[PDB]
Amino acid sequence: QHYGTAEVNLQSGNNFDGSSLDFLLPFYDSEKMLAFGQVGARYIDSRFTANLGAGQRFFLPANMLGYNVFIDQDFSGDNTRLGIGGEYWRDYFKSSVNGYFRMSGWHESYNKKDYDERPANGFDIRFNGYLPSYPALGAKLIYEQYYGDNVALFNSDKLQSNPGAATVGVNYTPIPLVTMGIDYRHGTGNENDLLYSMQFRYQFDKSWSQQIEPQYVNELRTLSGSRYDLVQRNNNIILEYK
Numbered sequence: 178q179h180y181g182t183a184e185v186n187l188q189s190g191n192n193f194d195g196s197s198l199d200f201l202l203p204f205y206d207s208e209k210m211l212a213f214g215q216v217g218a219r220y221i222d223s224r225f226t227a228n229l230g231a232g233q234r235f236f237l238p239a240n241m242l243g244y245n246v247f248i249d250q251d252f253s254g255d256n257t258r259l260g261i262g263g264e265y266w267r268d269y270f271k272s273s274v275n276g277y278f279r280m281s282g283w284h285e286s287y288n289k290k291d292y293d294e295r296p297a298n299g300f301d302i303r304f305n306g307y308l309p310s311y312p313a314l315g316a317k318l319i320y321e322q323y324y325g326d327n328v329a330l331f332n333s334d335k336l337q338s339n340p341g342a343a344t345v346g347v348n349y350t351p352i353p354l355v356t357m358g359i360d361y362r363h364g365t366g367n368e369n370d371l372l373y374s375m376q377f378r379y380q381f382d383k384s385w386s387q388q389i390e391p392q393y394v395n396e397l398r399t400l401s402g403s404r405y406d407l408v409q410r411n412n413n414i415i416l417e418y419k
């Protein structure tokens with residue numbers, strides 16, 4: 178009957194501690210094409226942010242191409258951002274690229290006394306792969322890049338010019354319902370951080386028992402099982418300061 182995904186994320190490790198809930202909700206669903214909306218919110222790094230997007234995914238037997246557009250709103254700091262994303266996915270392999278475009282201007286900072294803040298423009302490229310012979314095991318590679326004289330990519334107490342970072346992570350999905358992982362990130366100025374995270378994933382089209390059985394993890398990681406996965410993007414609005 179119903180199709181799509183609800184996902185809770187819990188994360189900790191430093192600056193971006195908190196929780197989130199997101200939904201992927203199809204409005205047109207055929208073998209060749211899916212059109213969907215995605216909506217969610219999060220309380221992370223002492224800010225409340227909500228996000229609304231839509232896109233399409235186009236399917237071939239061996240691959241999927243997709244695009245999406247997002248509006249990101251940090252209600253705590255009143256910062257607004259436009260997002261655009263592309264997708265190229267296959268069995269056991271999900272690649273995405275995302276662009277992050279400021280829609281609001283300088284204004285008095287929410288967290289930093291004596292500063293103005295606004296969204297930092299940037300992009301990221303994201304890969305998630307799963308071992309085909311043991312798909313419960315996944316790896317994550319991200320490159321991200323942001324622009325401005327004083328950007329807070331790692332935290333807002335160490336501001337940096339045009340910072341970039343590479344993330345490498347591993348994660349484990351014993352059953353489709355839950356994924357746990359650890360992400361290591363290294364960036365400019367020799368910044369490093371660690372992110373521990375757990376996701377609870379509910380698939381609307383799956384029975385309860387299917388979602389707590391290890392044998393359905395492989396299905397989830399194939400192209401056709403992954404079709405309702407959330408967009409891979411950063412839903413947090415990275416800020417710059419002046």
Ligand SMILES: CCCCCCCC/C=C\CCCCCCCC(=O)OC[C@@H](O)CO
Nearest residue numbers: 204205212213230231232233245246247259
């Ligand atoms: C702020 C300016 C940026 C623009 C924001 C607009 C965001 C919308 C983005 C993507 C929406 C595209 C999805 C809409 C595409 C729907 C296609 C469809 O359902 O066709 C089915 C028929 O073929 C059945 O016969």
Ligand SMILES: CCCCCCCC/C=C\CCCCCCCC(=O)OC[C@@H](O)CO
Nearest residue numbers: 263264265272273274302322338339340341
């Ligand atoms: C579905 C799409 C997946 C395909 C991935 C796309 C491949 C992208 C290839 C190369 C991206 C390299 C970006 C280039 C790296 C940018 C570095 C920069 O902007 O300057 C930093 C200085 O200004 C600091 O002061």
Ligand SMILES: CCCCCCCC/C=C\CCCCCCCC(=O)OC[C@@H](O)CO
Nearest residue numbers: 178179183184185198354377378379380381
């Ligand atoms: C710390 C534990 C966090 C809670 C774990 C929750 C796991 C799922 C995560 C988000 C789910 C929220 C939305 C859950 C929505 C479920 C709707 C439902 O029950 O299906 C109707 C069908 O039975 C009709 O046939």
Ligand SMILES: CCCCCCCC/C=C\CCCCCCCC(=O)OC[C@H](O)CO
Nearest residue numbers: 187188189195196348349357358373374375
């Ligand atoms: C090979 C695979 C390796 C993976 C194995 C690594 C194990 C780490 C697992 C889970 C960490 C869970 C962290 C949960 C985060 C705590 C909740 C939180 O910090 O946020 C609450 C916040 O107050 C709300 O707004």
Ligand SMILES: CCCCCCCC/C=C\CCCCCCCC(=O)OC[C@H](O)CO
Nearest residue numbers: 203204205206207212213214230231232246
């Ligand atoms: C600036 C222009 C971009 C537009 C941005 C708006 C976001 C959604 C847009 C259009 C929905 C168009 C119609 C498609 C919506 C449902 C499609 C449909 O007709 O479904 C048929 C039915 O499901 C058969 O089983």
Ligand SMILES: CCCCCCCC/C=C\CCCCCCCC(=O)OC[C@H](O)CO
Nearest residue numbers: 202203204205206214229230231246247248
């Ligand atoms: C900047 C972009 C703003 C985003 C705005 C984009 C427009 C669509 C977005 C969300 C719709 C929410 C999803 C709609 C849920 C409808 C469910 C439905 O139609 O059920 C029929 C079935 O899903 C058919 O298979």
Ligand SMILES: CCCCCCCC/C=C\CCCCCCCC(=O)OC[C@H](O)CO
Nearest residue numbers: 179180200202214215216217227228229248
């Ligand atoms: C920029 C707009 C001004 C600000 C607006 C703030 C409020 C909008 C929040 C969320 C919209 C998306 C919610 C869509 C939820 C629809 C899900 C649904 O009803 O479809 C499932 C149903 O079971 C199928 O038959």
Ligand SMILES: CCCCCCCC/C=C\CCCCCCCC(=O)OC[C@H](O)CO
Nearest residue numbers: 179200216217218227228229248249250381
């Ligand atoms: C740009 C600002 C956007 C702000 C947006 C307001 C805050 C929305 C926050 C969280 C989710 C919103 C609730 C949407 C719930 C839809 C889920 C749904 O329709 O469920 C389908 C059903 O469960 C099938 O089994």
Ligand SMILES: CCCCCCCC/C=C\CCCCCCCC(=O)OC[C@H](O)CO
Nearest residue numbers: 242243244261262263274275276299300324
């Ligand atoms: C139909 C199949 C669709 C598949 C194809 C979808 C194509 C669009 C996808 C992603 C957009 C990525 C946007 C990346 C923009 C880079 C932003 C940037 O580089 O800003 C730096 C600026 O110059 C400061 O100096």
Ligand SMILES: CCCCCCCC/C=C\CCCCCCCC(=O)OC[C@H](O)CO
Nearest residue numbers: 263264274275276299300301302322324339
């Ligand atoms: C559809 C597939 C799309 C894939 C594309 C994703 C990767 C490229 C993204 C951004 C590159 C932008 C290049 C910007 C790097 C240099 C900007 C710069 O030099 O900064 C301004 C200057 O320093 C002032 O003095």
Ligand SMILES: CCCCCCCC/C=C\CCCCCCCC(=O)OC[C@H](O)CO
Nearest residue numbers: 267268269270306307308309314315316347
């Ligand atoms: C536990 C420490 C790390 C362990 C976890 C590391 C998992 C491996 C990650 C990426 C390699 C696998 C990526 C999969 C690449 C296959 C590309 C593909 O599309 O394969 C088609 C499929 O084999 C037929 O349909």
Ligand SMILES: [Cl-]
Nearest residue numbers: 303305409410
């Ligand atoms: Cl990701």
